Amino acid sequence: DMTNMDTRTRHLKVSNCPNNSYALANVAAVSPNDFPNNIYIIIDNLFVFTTRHSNDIPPGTIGFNGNQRTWGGWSLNQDVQAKAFDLFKYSGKQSYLGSIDIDISFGKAVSTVFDQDELAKQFVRCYESQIFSPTQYLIMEFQGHFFDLKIRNVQAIDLGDIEPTSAVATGIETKGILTKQTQINFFKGRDGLVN
Amino acid sequence: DMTNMDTRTRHLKVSNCPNNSYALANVAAVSPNDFPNNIYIIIDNLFVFTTRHSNDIPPGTIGFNGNQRTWGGWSLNQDVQAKAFDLFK
Amino acid sequence: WYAQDQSVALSNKCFIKCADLKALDGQYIEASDIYSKLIKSSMGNRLSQWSLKDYFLKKGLCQLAATDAVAAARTLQEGQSEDPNFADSRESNFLKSLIDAVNEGDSEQLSEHCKEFDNFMRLDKWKITILNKIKESIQQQEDDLL
């Protein structure tokens, strides 16, 4: 519910993620004072994240896992400007994901065929109700195997298009919230090993 | 002694093993309120494990090591059903 | 106090050993900061050129022991762009290859690069301890990886 919330810019210094749970949640770990919980924030007007409260992160600092930092091109202890991001006001109507495409990547590799459905199920289960843009690196653990998941392309549609008429867009600009009905496609990883 | 036991099913979460020593121990580490000590418990009617009391795991959750997950093809935080076991019958 | 006395050389030497002890004792960020101080104080002097050639590498190594790969990357880029001699120096190439190996998380490749660096320039205990710490960080990463 974003009808009533502040959107002021706050200067937060990127830091190490506190533990693997927050990284596995695909959330920006922020102090309770910095931002409420489970709310969308955009940094640099480019990278959208969902806040999660963490008592180990003092006010004035933002916490990120490694993949998000590599995606953001941020160094440790570097300032970034973060504002509250409203997808509904931003995209207007292309606020849902019609089809989302992800690289799945693994020395511990496995050659067996991977059935996309379980990856889709567990991915959505872990990261439901989150704003997603293309080219996003993430870490996700499956059957004891750690994978890096790199969103290729996001197709953004409004809730109501029976036939998807929005082109599969690769730009960071397009954004949509993940839902069960999203057409999730997987292909070979950053590693190129996953079959 | 396995003659008497609560055989009722419980929904337990998969988690990282509490430490390497427990992974070596090859015992399902459970809280005292969960189930007795030194007794065989089956999970999904297929995966058998030996309970051992463990205060670090709260009631209602089960700890696993990577080998057991990989045997079961399970991801972390996965919800599974656990019951008592008796091989002799 | 040597900086207060305007004695460049005494301060530079004391800073070298100070950063050495700080990096070897686990305190990478402050040691790299002192190496940045050494770089700035020694920049533009033809007598301390060789020292600079070493400094950039040492700073990158310390920042890489602190799991800040981007920090070693900027340290290397600063060394290449600011110091022409270090740009063509084997130290710069060793630092890029260390950065690349840790980017891939390929401990084998890292071990190899230590071997070639030893092959032409015998490595010092300071760098061995730091690089062992980086490898063991790949191994702690491996422990995380389950």
DSSP C10-37: HHHHHHHHHHHHHHHTT-HHHHHHHHHH
β-bridge mates for residue A141, sequence order? A146
Is-contact A97 A179, C-beta < 8 A?
yes
**Number of Cβ pairs < 8 A linking chain A and chain C:** 15
State whether C70 and A75 contact (CB < 8 Å). Answer: yes
Q: Using CA atoms, how far apart are residues C105 and A195, in angstroms rounded to an integer?
A: 22
Task: List the single residue in A with minimal CA-CA distance to B74.
Answer: A143
Place of tokens 């600079």: C52
The two three-digit tokens of residue C77, written as one number: 């880029």
* Distances from the Cα of B37 to the Cα of B5, B28, B41, angstroms: 11, 10, 11
In a mutational test of the B interface, the residue from A121, A145, A149 whose CB has the highest number of chain B CBs within 10 Å is A145
- d(C-alpha B10, C-alpha B7), whole Å: 9
DSSP 3-state of A137: strand
CB–CB of A75 and C145 under 8 A?
Answer: no
| DSSP per residue, A167-194 | --B-STT--EE--TTSEEEEEE-SSS--
What phi and psi values does residue A153 have, to the nearest 5 degrees?
Answer: -140, 145
Whole-angstrom Cα distance, residue A119 to residue A140? 9
SS3 string, chain A, reads CCCCCCCCCEEEEEEECCCHHHHHCCEEEECCCCCCCCCEEEECCCEEEEEEECCCCCCCEEEECHHHHHHHCCCCCCEEEEEECCHHHHHCCCCEEEEEEEEEECCCCCCCCCCHHHHHHHHHHHCCCCEECCCCEEEEEECCEEEEEEEEEEEEECCCCCCCCCCCECCCCCCEECCCCCEEEEEECCCCCCC
Query: Alpha-carbon distance A66 to A22, whole Å?
Result: 11
Measured distance CA(B37)–CA(A99) in Å, rounded: 50
Distance CA A123, CA A140 (A): 8
In whole angstroms, give the CA distance from residue A150 to residue A133.
10
Phi/psi of residue A151, each to 5°? -65, 120
Cα–Cα distance between B8 and B84 in angstroms, integer? Answer: 7
Spatial distance between the Cα atoms of B68 and B75, rounded to a whole number of angstroms: 11
Instruction: Please name which of C74, C69, C65, C50 lies closest in space to residue C19, comparing C-alpha atoms.
Output: C65
CB contacts of C70 in chain A (<8 Å) are 69, 74-76
CB A166 within 8 A of CB A156: yes
For tokens 């076991």, name the residue: B85
Does residue A9 contact residue A43 with C-beta atoms inside 8 Å? no
* Contact call for residues A81 and A11 (beta carbons, < 8 A): yes
Neighbours of C8 (CB within 10 A): 15
Please state how this structure was obtained: cryo-EM
Q: Which residues of B fall within a CB distance of 8 Å from A24?
A: 76
Nearest Cα neighbor of C134 from C118, C116, C114, C120 is: C114
Residue C67 with chain A: CB contacts under 8 Å: 16
Contact between chains at C71 and A75 (C-beta distance less than 8 A): yes
Looking at the partner chain, which of A24, A122, A143 has a beta carbon nearest the beta carbon of B69?
A143
**Selected residues 35-74 of chain B with any CB under 8 Å from a CB in chain A:** 66, 69-70, 73-74
d(CA A97, CA A178): 6
- Look-up of token digits 């463990």: B54
Inter-chain residue contact B70 with A24, CB threshold 8 Å: no
Q: Any residues with CB less than 8 A from the CB of B1 and at least 6 apart, and which?
A: none
Q: What is the DSSP letter of A64?
A: E
Distance between CA atoms of residues A18 and B56, nearest Å = 21
Q: CB–CB of C72/C65 below 8 Å?
A: no
- A36 vs C104: CA distance, rounded Å: 36
Beta bridge partners of residue A188, listed in sequence order: A104
The minimum CA-CA distance between B5 and chain A, rounded to whole Å, is 31
Instruction: Give CA–CA dist B13/B62, Å, rounded.
Output: 6
Give the burial string for C73-101 (b: 16+ CB within 10 Å, else e): bebbebbbeebeebeebebbebbbbbbeb
Spatial CB neighbours of C91, under 8 Å, sequence gap ≥ 6? C53, C54, C56, C57
Chains A–B, number of C-beta pairs less than 8 Å apart: 15
Stated as kind and residue range, the H or E segment containing C68 is: none
Tokens 């959208």 -> residue? A48
Residues in chain C closer than 8 A to A16 (CB atoms) = 67
**Amino acid code (one letter) for A191:** D
CB contact under 8 A, B66 and A144: yes
B40-78 exposure pattern, b = at least 16 Cβ within 10 A, e = fewer = ebbbeeebebebeebeebeeebbbbbeebbeebebbbbb
Q: Please name the residue of chain C whose CA is at the shortest distance from the CA of residue A76.
A: C68
Cα–Cα distance, B77 to C51 (Å, whole number): 53
| Strand partners for B12 | B80
Please choose, from the candidates B27, B22, B41, B23, the residue with its C-alpha nearest in 3D space to the C-alpha of residue B85. B41
Cα–Cα dist A44/C120, whole Å: 45
Residue in this structure with the two tokens 């890292």, named with its chain if needed: C110
Which contiguous run of DSSP H or E holds residue B27? strand B27-30
Collapsing DSSP to helix, strand or coil, C145 comes out as coil
Q: Closest Cα to residue C108, out of A21, A107, B67, A178?
A: A107
Closest CA to A147 of A133, A157, A132, A137: A137
Resolution in A: 3.9
Coil, strand or helix: which one is B17? coil
Whether B79 contacts chain A with CB within 8 A: no
Q: In sequence order, which residues have a C-beta less than 8 Å from that of residue B89 and are 6 or more positions away?
A: none
Residue type, B32: P
CA separation for the pair C43, C41 (Å, rounded): 6
Question: Residue for token digits 């996965």?
Answer: B78
Region class of A103: left (phi > 0), else alpha (psi between -120 and 50), else beta: beta
Name subunits touching C (3+ CB pairs < 8 A). Answer: A
Which tokens go with A173?
């600009």
Residues contacting A170, CB < 8 A, separation 6+: A134, A135, A152, A153, A154
Which amino acid makes up residue A140?
M
> Is B34 exposed, middle or buried, given 0-12, 13-18 or 19+ CB atoms closer than 10 A?
buried
- Alpha-carbon distance A136 to A49, whole Å? 11
Whole-number Å distance between alpha carbons of A41 and A39:
7
Distance of alpha carbon B38 from alpha carbon A122, whole angstroms: 34
Beta pairing class for A40-43 and A96-105: unpaired
Closest CA to B26 of B12, B13, B41: B41
8 A C-beta contact, residue B18 and residue B29:
yes
Chain B neighbours (≥3 Cβ pairs under 8 A) are: A
SS3 of A133, please?
Answer: coil
- Closest-CA residue to B51 (of B65, B38, B32, B34): B38
| Å between A3 CA and nearest CA of chain B | 34
Grouping H, G, I as helix, E, B as strand and the rest as coil, residue A152 is strand
B66 vs A contacts (CB less than 8 Å): 144
A24 touches chain B (CB under 8 A): yes
Contact C70 A74 (CB under 8 A): yes
Tokens linked to C100: 């690349």
